[PDB]
Design a binder for this molecule. Structure first.
Ligand SMILES: CC[C@]1(C(=O)NCc2ccccc2)CCN(C)CCN1
Length: 130
């Protein structure tokens, strides 16, 4: 229905605003663009499904996310990719792990304060109906 398309358009407006608030933070600059295979040729041999905040914006605009749950699985993949690629005790690895955990905690905290639980339940019911 038109009302169902209006529900998904509101979900996209909400997700683009959360994603842009993450992408302007200093702590998260390293997560804003894909890894340049020239600067890091090893990356795509270790990390099988790369993800970044620019790609998240592209996926919102392509109508890939019908629920906040499917958006948060891509925020989780940004975080887990950083933890797996940078696992050592050295300070550069520890700094990107701390930033990756802060990106995931920040996204979940914005969604906990600003997403109505009944709005997400409606999206999940339209998705399960299709
Ligand atoms: C220099 C580019 C910049 C940016 O806005 N890119 C757009 C963007 C928007 C949403 C998701 C990923 C990327 C400047 C803003 N910030 C300070 C730092 C991030 N990088």
């Amino acid at each position: 229905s038109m009302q169902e398309e209006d529900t998904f358009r509101e979900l996209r407006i909400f997700l683009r605003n959360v994603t842009h608030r993450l992408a302007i933070d200093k702590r998260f600059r390293v997560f804003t663009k894909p890894v340049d295979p020239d600067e890091v040729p090893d990356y795509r041999t270790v990390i099988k499904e790369p993800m970044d905040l620019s790609s998240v914006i592209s996926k919102i605009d392509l109508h890939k996310y019908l629920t906040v749950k499917d958006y948060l699985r891509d925020i989780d993949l940004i975080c887990s990719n950083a933890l797996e690629y940078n696992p050592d005790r050295d300070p550069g690895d520890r700094l990107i792990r701390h930033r990756a955990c802060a990106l995931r905690d920040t996204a979940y905290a914005i969604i906990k304060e600003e997403l109505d639980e009944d709005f997400e339940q409606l999206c999940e019911e339209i998705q399960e109906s299709r």
